[PDB]
Design a protein around this motif. Structure first.
Motif, mmCIF file in Angstrom:
data_model
loop_
_atom_site.group_PDB
_atom_site.id
_atom_site.type_symbol
_atom_site.label_atom_id
_atom_site.label_comp_id
_atom_site.label_asym_id
_atom_site.label_seq_id
_atom_site.Cartn_x
_atom_site.Cartn_y
_atom_site.Cartn_z
ATOM 1 N N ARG A 102 -3.919 -8.991 4.605
ATOM 2 C CA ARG A 102 -2.918 -8.569 3.616
ATOM 3 C C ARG A 102 -1.558 -9.210 3.867
ATOM 4 N N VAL A 130 -10.824 7.469 -3.864
ATOM 5 C CA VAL A 130 -9.502 7.535 -3.256
ATOM 6 C C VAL A 130 -8.886 6.145 -3.188
ATOM 7 N N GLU A 131 -7.605 6.099 -3.517
ATOM 8 C CA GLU A 131 -6.792 4.887 -3.480
ATOM 9 C C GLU A 131 -5.356 5.333 -3.208
ATOM 10 N N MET A 132 -4.379 4.429 -3.278
ATOM 11 C CA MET A 132 -3.046 4.747 -2.758
ATOM 12 C C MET A 132 -1.885 4.290 -3.648
ATOM 13 N N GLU A 133 -2.077 4.183 -4.964
ATOM 14 C CA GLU A 133 -0.993 3.685 -5.822
ATOM 15 C C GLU A 133 -0.882 4.275 -7.224
ATOM 16 N N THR A 182 -8.740 -1.724 -5.015
ATOM 17 C CA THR A 182 -9.968 -1.213 -4.436
ATOM 18 C C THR A 182 -9.838 0.274 -4.202
ATOM 19 N N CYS A 183 -10.966 0.926 -3.937
ATOM 20 C CA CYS A 183 -10.980 2.348 -3.707
ATOM 21 C C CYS A 183 -12.221 2.744 -2.929
ATOM 22 N N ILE A 193 -0.806 3.763 8.152
ATOM 23 C CA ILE A 193 -2.037 2.991 8.350
ATOM 24 C C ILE A 193 -1.957 2.170 9.634
ATOM 25 N N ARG A 219 -2.783 -2.393 -12.505
ATOM 26 C CA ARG A 219 -3.192 -2.447 -11.108
ATOM 27 C C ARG A 219 -4.659 -2.874 -11.040
ATOM 28 N N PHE A 240 -4.238 7.525 4.491
ATOM 29 C CA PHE A 240 -5.527 6.852 4.598
ATOM 30 C C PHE A 240 -6.399 7.538 5.638
ATOM 31 N N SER A 273 -15.147 -0.166 -2.966
ATOM 32 C CA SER A 273 -15.436 -1.025 -1.826
ATOM 33 C C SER A 273 -16.280 -0.345 -0.761
ATOM 34 N N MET A 288 0.818 -1.205 0.000
ATOM 35 C CA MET A 288 0.000 0.000 0.000
ATOM 36 C C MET A 288 0.852 1.255 0.000
HETATM 37 O O1 LIG Z 1 -11.139 4.664 1.250
HETATM 38 C C1 LIG Z 1 -9.880 4.378 0.900
HETATM 39 N N1 LIG Z 1 -8.872 5.215 1.164
HETATM 40 C C2 LIG Z 1 -7.616 4.930 0.795
HETATM 41 N N2 LIG Z 1 -7.242 3.808 0.157
HETATM 42 C C3 LIG Z 1 -8.199 2.886 -0.143
HETATM 43 C C4 LIG Z 1 -9.589 3.137 0.207
HETATM 44 N N3 LIG Z 1 -10.327 2.089 -0.203
HETATM 45 C C5 LIG Z 1 -9.464 1.217 -0.774
HETATM 46 N N4 LIG Z 1 -8.195 1.704 -0.760
HETATM 47 C C6 LIG Z 1 -7.053 0.914 -1.254
HETATM 48 O O2 LIG Z 1 -6.802 -0.117 -0.308
HETATM 49 C C7 LIG Z 1 -5.558 0.144 0.390
HETATM 50 C C8 LIG Z 1 -5.850 0.868 1.680
HETATM 51 O O3 LIG Z 1 -6.740 0.131 2.492
HETATM 52 C C9 LIG Z 1 -4.706 0.931 -0.579
HETATM 53 O O4 LIG Z 1 -3.954 0.045 -1.398
HETATM 54 C C10 LIG Z 1 -5.740 1.707 -1.427
HETATM 55 O O5 LIG Z 1 -5.403 1.819 -2.782
#
Ligand SMILES: O=c1[nH]cnc2c1ncn2[C@@H]1O[C@H](CO)[C@@H](O)[C@H]1O
Ligand SMILES: O=c1[nH]cnc2c1ncn2[C@@H]1O[C@H](CO)[C@@H](O)[C@H]1O
Ligand SMILES: O=c1[nH]cnc2c1ncn2[C@@H]1O[C@H](CO)[C@@H](O)[C@H]1O
Ligand SMILES: O=c1[nH]cnc2c1ncn2[C@@H]1O[C@H](CO)[C@@H](O)[C@H]1O
Ligand SMILES: O=c1[nH]cnc2c1ncn2[C@@H]1O[C@H](CO)[C@@H](O)[C@H]1O
Ligand SMILES: O=c1[nH]cnc2c1ncn2[C@@H]1O[C@H](CO)[C@@H](O)[C@H]1O
Lengths: 226, 226, 226, 226, 226, 226
Positions: C42, B177-180, B89-90, C70, B86, B158, B202, B63
Motif C-alpha cells: 500500500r 466489513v470494510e473501512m471507508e 475490498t472487504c 492496523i 470507492r 480491523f 477478498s 484506510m
Molecule cells: O476483513 C476486513 N476487515 C476490515 N477491512 C477490510 C477487510 N477486508 C478488506 N478491507 C479493506 O481493506 C483495508 C484494510 O485492510 C480497508 O481499506 C478496508 O476497507
C-alpha cells in the motif's frame, strides 16, 4: 398471537402494512377479492384476499417503532410471513420533494434507541431488500409516478420542540419523516425475510386529496408483492 | 488542497477511490489513456486520464474513516468533484457471501463516532446515490458478475478483540466489513454529490488471485462513472 | 502480517512512526546507516537501519486512528516491537503554543469511539510511557528546543463543521490537534509495550520551513529510542 | 465561599488536598508551623501554616468527584489558589503495584459523567501539570521512595457489582483506583492553574501501618509545592 | 466496615442521613436521648440514641452520589439497616417553590453516570418507598408545614458552567437541586430496603435562618422512622 | 388536531387513556351517560360523556411512547385537557406482584431515547402528579383492591431478545412492564398538567378474566378524575 387473533394459515406470506387500520380496510375493499377479516384485536384490522390470483394480506400497524415492532414480530414469528411492504405516508423535509411523490426507502435514520440497545456502540443502518426495492421502483416507473429512492427519518416524536436536527438531516439528503421504517427493516433483516417501505408524501414539515396517487402506490406495492 | 497538490482543473468530475494508492496506479496504467499523475503528497497517488472519451480520475484514500474523509472533503470542496466511486475490498461476514463476489453497498453500519457527533441522539444511515447504484448494478449484471446489493460494516478497528457484534451484524444481513463507506456516503450527501462503493470480497472474517474479478469490477465502476 | 510484508526479525524492537511514508523514507535516508526497505505494501514504506550502533526501524502509519491501529497491532503482535515513538505534526489550538514547538503528548483526548467500545461507560485516558517521555523531554531540553509536555486532541475529523468544541478543549489546556496518539497509546498499554508521541507544531487551527526543527525532533525521538 | 468560611487572604496559593479532613489536621500539626484553622464548615477542616519559610494550606476534600469539585472550584475562584496537590490513598489494580508504593497520576480514567457533559461526543483526558509532576517525581526519587508515574481510575463507585471493567483497565496499565483526580485535573486545567495527585497505595482491589511512607509522601508533596 | 468503625449492633435499623456530619451531631444532641457516637472515621460522625422509645441512628453522608453511596452500601450490607431517610437541603429551581418549603422526593433526575453503567441503554428512575413517603407527607401535613411532593435533580456538579439544562428541568416540574437522592433511592431498591429524602429549601438557584423549619422537618423524618 | 377530528370544546378537561380504542368504547358504554363519539380517525376512538355529574372523556392512545405522545400532545395543546389518567395493562416482573393487582406508577424507567434527546447527558425521571396519585391510591384502598405504588418500565420493545436487563430492573424493585407511562408523565410535566397511570397486571413476564378487577380500576381512575 398476542395481538392478532388469526388462525394458523389465515395470513398470506405477502403482506401490506399501512399504519392506519382503516387504510387496511380500504385496501382490502378496493383491491382484493375473496376477502376475510382475520383480526380486530385493538381495532387493528387485518385482512386476507386475492389479487391477480395470489393471496395477499393487509394489516394495520399503528404508529411508531414500538407498535409496528409488535405486529411485525408476530407476523414473522407466528404466521410465517416472508414479504412485508409498508404502505404509508410521510412529511417532506426538503423543497425538492413534492407532495404526492412516492418515496421508496433504501434505508432509514432514527432517533429511536431500539438499535443502540441491540448493537451497543454501533450505528446500525436498516436496509431495504434490494430485490423488492427494484421491483417496486420499476413498477412505479412504468406506472408513470414520481418515484424517489433514498433515505428517510423514522421518528419517535411527531411533535418535536426544535426542528434543527430534522432540518440538518434534510441538508444531508434525508427526504421525509415517518414513524415505522427502521423497525420494519431491522426486524425483517433479523429474521431473514424481505421488507420495503413505499410512502406517499402528504405534506411538508416546514386522504381524498391524495387518493388517486395513493391507489397507484398501493398498486405498485401489491405488484412488488405478487 | 492541504493533502492534494493538484492545480485547479486537473481532477475530473468523476473519480474512483481505491484505498490503496498502488491500486490507483494500477487502475490508471491498466484502463486509462492520456494519463498524468496530479498528486504524490504522502505517497497518496492520484491520476487523471481518459476512459472511452471521458476524463476520469483515480485517487487513493488510505484506510479508515478519518483518512478517506480528508480526501473526499478536499476533492468535493476544492476540486469540484461530482461522482465518487470507492473501489475496494472487504471481508465477508456471512457464509452466503463468497470470495470474489462484488458487493454494492446500499448503506453502511459503523462503529465510528463521526455521525453521532454530527447528529447527537440520532442513528444516521449513510446511503448510496440510487442512480449510480442502479447503473453499477445493471453493468455488473450484464458483465456476468455475482453482484450483491446490501449493507456493509464500516469499521474503525480491523483487529477487534471480540467478534461478537460483527457476527451479530452478519445475522442481521450485513454482508461484509470494510473501512471507508460511511464517510464517503455521509460527506457526499452533505455536499449534494453522488457516491457509491463497489467492493470485491477478498476473504471471510470467520491481489493476483482476484485480479480478473477485480478488473471486471473496475470496469463496472468506470462505466457507472462515464 | 496482513499489511506489512517483512520477514520475521527484519523489524527492530524500537521504531519511529511518522504518519507520512515519505517521511519514513526521509528519516531512513537522512539518519540511518545500513538501511533496507522491508515494506512497500500500500506504499506504506518501512525501513530498518542502524543509528549509533543500534538497529532501529521507521514505519509510515497513514492518517487517523484506524490506519495507525492496523500498523501498531501488526508491529506489536507479529513483529515483537517494544518501543514505539510517533514522530508527527500537529495544529496548535492555543496562542501560547507556537509553530515549530515540539509537543510531547502525556495523554490524548479524542472524538473517536474506539475506547468507548472497549470500555463501555468509561472515559479511558490513554497515557504515554513515562520513562520514554522523560528521556525525550530531557533530550529535547538538552538540544535547546522549545518542548511542551501536555495534552493533545486525537481527531477523527480533520475538517470539522464547527470548531466550538476544539476551542473549548484549548481553553482546558489541550495544546494541539493530531490524528493518531489515542490509538498508539491505548494499544501499547494493551500489550504492555512502551509508546510516546513527539510532534512538531506545523500551524495554528485558528516541510522545508520546519525541516531543521523537524530533524532536531527526529534526533530526540531516535535518542529516546536508543 | 459557600463551603469554606475563610476570609480573603487566609488560604495560601499552594494547597494540599487530602480526602480526609482528619488527615488535613494531621498534616498541619505534623509538618506546619504558625498554623491556623480557617474552616470547619461541614467538618471539612482547612488550615494554613508555614513550611520551610513558605505559607501553605491543607484542605480536606471529602470523597468523590462531586465533593472535591465543590472545594476545588471555591479554592480557585474565591481564594485565588494556584498550585493544588491531592495527597491521597488508592487501591492497586495490578500485581506489579505494591502496597506503600507512591503513585503520581499523569492522567485519570473515569466512570463519572462530568466530562461527557462538558464535552459531548469526546473523551477528555484530564492531565497533570508536568512541571509539578516532574518536581514531585524528582523529590520522591531523591527521597528513596518507590514512585510509579502512570494512569489511575477515578471511580464514582467504591462498591461495584462487577469488577470486570476494573480488571480490564488494569490490563491496560491503569495502576490503581481512587475517587478524585479526574475532577482536580479537569478543573485546574479549566482555570489555568497547576494540579497534581500523589497517592499512597493502601491495599489491592483483588493509617499507622503506612504512616512512615505517608509522611515521606506528604514531604514530597510539600516540596513540589514550595 | 471500611468507613464506619461501629461494632455490630451499634447502628439502629432506622437511620437519618444528613449530608453534613455536624448536622448529625446537632440532630443527636437536640432530639435523641441515651446517645453514643459510633463513628468518627474521616470526621463522618454517626450516633445512635433513643427517640420516643425507639432506637434510631443518624449518620453524615458527605456530599455527592459517590460519598453517600459508600455510606449507604456499608449501612445496608454491614449493619443491616432497613429504613433510611435523608434529611437534607436543596436549591429551588422554580419560582413556585419557596425557601423553607419541605420537599419530599418521589424520584430524582441526575447527571450522574451511576445508573447508566448499571443499566446500559436504559433510563432508571430511582423511586422513594411509598409507605415511608406517605408517612412523612401525612406527618408534615399534620405539623402544618408547606410540603411539596415531587421530582428533584441529583447533581454531580454544584458549580455548572451553563444552567440551561437545570432551567429546562425546572420547566418540566423538577423542584430543586441536591446531590444525593439518586444514589440513596437506587441502592435501597437494589437491597430491598426502604428509603426517602426529605429536604428543606435553603435558597433559589436563579442554618439558623431555617432552624425552626429544619427542626420541624427532622421531627417528621424521625416520625416516619419510628 | 392532526389525529383527532373533534371540534373545540368536545373533549373534557379530564380524560382516561386506555391503550386499546376498543377499551375506550367499553368504558364509555359501561360507565358514562350522555355519550358522544368525537373521534374515529385511524380507528382511535374517543368519547365524551358524563360520570356522576361531571363531563369526562376517554381516548385510545395506541401502543408505545410514539403513539401515546401524539395523542397526549394534541389533547393538551389543542384541546386544553388538564387531567390525564392512563388506564392500562402491564406484565409483572416480580413474583411479589400478582395478576389482577392494580399498580399506580410513581415514576417509570425506560429504554426509549425520548428523554435523552430532550435532556442530553441527564437521566430524566418522569413523575406522577402526587395529588392525583394520592386520590387514586385512597380510592383503590377504600374499594378493597390490592394496590401497589411504585416503579414501572416503559418499554419500546415488547419482544426483547434478552430479558437480562428486565430481570435486573425487577431486582431493583421495578414492578411491571408497559409501553406508555414515560411519555404521558413527561409531556404532562412539560405542559404543567396532571397525569397518572393506573394499571392492571395481566400476566407475568417470566379481558373477561380480569373484567371485574378492570372495572373496579376504571372506577378509581374515574373517581380520581371527578
Ligand atoms: O476483513 C476486513 N476487515 C476490515 N477491512 C477490510 C477487510 N477486508 C478488506 N478491507 C479493506 O481493506 C483495508 C484494510 O485492510 C480497508 O481499506 C478496508 O476497507
Ligand atoms: O410529518 C410527519 N411526521 C411524522 N410522521 C408522519 C408525517 N407524515 C406522515 N407520517 C406518518 O403518519 C403517522 C403519523 O401521523 C405515522 O405512521 C408516520 O409514519
Ligand atoms: O491541524 C491539524 N489537524 C489534524 N491533524 C493534523 C493537523 N496538523 C497536523 N496533523 C497531522 O497530520 C495529518 C493530517 O494532515 C494527521 O496525521 C495528523 O496527525
Ligand atoms: O480501593 C479503593 N477504591 C476506591 N477509592 C479508594 C480506594 N482506596 C483508597 N481510595 C480513596 O479513599 C477514599 C475511599 O475510601 C476515596 O477518597 C479514594 O480516593
Ligand atoms: O443549590 C444547590 N445545589 C446543589 N446542592 C445543594 C444546593 N442546595 C443544597 N444542596 C445540598 O447541599 C450540599 C451542597 O452544598 C449537597 O449535599 C446538596 O444535596
Ligand atoms: O408484558 C407486557 N409487556 C409490554 N407491554 C405490556 C405487557 N402487558 C401489557 N402491556 C401493555 O399492553 C400493550 C402491549 O400489549 C401496551 O400498551 C402495554 O402498555
Amino acid at each position: 398471537s398476542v395481538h392478532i387473533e388469526a388462525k394458523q394459515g389465515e395470513i398470506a406470506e405477502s403482506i401490506l402494512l399501512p399504519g392506519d387500520p382503516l387504510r387496511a380496510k380500504y385496501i382490502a375493499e378496493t383491491f382484493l377479492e375473496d376477502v376475510t377479516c382475520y383480526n380486530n384485536v385493538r381495532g387493528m384490522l387485518g385482512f386476507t384476499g386475492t389479487y391477480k390470483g395470489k393471496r395477499v394480506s393487509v394489516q394495520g400497524t399503528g404508529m411508531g417503532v414500538p407498535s409496528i415492532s409488535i405486529y411485525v414480530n408476530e407476523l414473522i414469528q407466528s404466521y410465517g410471513v416472508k414479504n412485508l411492504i409498508r404502505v404509508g405516508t410521510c412529511g417532506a423535509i426538503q423543497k425538492d420533494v413534492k407532495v404526492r411523490d412516492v418515496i421508496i426507502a433504501m434505508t432509514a435514520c432514527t432517533d429511536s434507541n431500539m438499535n443502540r440497545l441491540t448493537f451497543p456502540g454501533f450505528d446500525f443502518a436498516p436496509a431495504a431488500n434490494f430485490d423488492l426495492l427494484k421491483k417496486a421502483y420499476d413498477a412505479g416507473t412504468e406506472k408513470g409516478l414520481h418515484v424517489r429512492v433514498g433515505n428517510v427519518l423514522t421518528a419517535d416524536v411527531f411533535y418535536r420542540e426544535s426542528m434543527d436536527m430534522v432540518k440538518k438531516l434534510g441538508d444531508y439528503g434525508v427526504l421525509a419523516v415517518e414513524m415505522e421504517t427502521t423497525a420494519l427493516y431491522t426486524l425483517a433483516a433479523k429474521y431473514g425475510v424481505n421488507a420495503l417501505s413505499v410512502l406517499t408524501v402528504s405534506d411538508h414539515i416546514f386522504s381524498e386529496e391524495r387518493q388517486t396517487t395513493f391507489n397507484e402506490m398501493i398498486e405498485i406495492a401489491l405488484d412488488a408483492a405478487i
